[PDB]
Amino acid sequence: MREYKLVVLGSGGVGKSALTVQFVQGIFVEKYDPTIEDSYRKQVEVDAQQCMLEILDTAGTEQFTAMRDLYMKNGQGFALVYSITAQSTFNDLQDLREQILRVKDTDDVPMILVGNKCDLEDERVVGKEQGQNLARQWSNCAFLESSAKSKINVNEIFYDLVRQINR
């Protein structure tokens, strides 16, 4: 079976772990905070093709890890996650995308931009159009808003990332 090495990136507290665990294990972490950078495995079918996914759930961009450039070089596709309730987490993604492009030395890198915590619409500070606009600037043709808590678009993040990889 074809294996896909996916990497989930973004600033602290946006729901990287929550999205990864909801996808792979089908449960919501609540307050559980892995802070090991573990890999999680799940087999799926995307567009009638069997896929074995390995998903690396990274620590926040703010935090120490001696493995970041390695993660970026070796990752086949990247989910760049922000929270719709924190503008800083959205703006932080611009530098992380640039770091990936620098390491890969190319602009053509499978990526999905993800605005998480859509269930906190009442606390939204990042517009959906702003997210759509950032993906546009990246010439990236995949953008989603999600909720790890409400299970909205969780599977679709990873399915769409697989699609960007095997386009």
Ligand SMILES: Nc1nc2c(ncn2[C@@H]2O[C@H](COP(=O)(O)OP(=O)(O)O)[C@@H](O)[C@H]2O)c(=O)[nH]1
């Ligand atoms: N309301 C809501 N809370 C979320 C969501 N995703 C994560 N959380 C919560 O936000 C906090 C941080 O989540 P976590 O997965 O640890 O973020 P990480 O630092 O990016 O790995 C936790 O309290 C989570 O329960 C979501 O989609 N909706």
Ligand SMILES: [Mg+2]
């Ligand atoms: Mg985490």
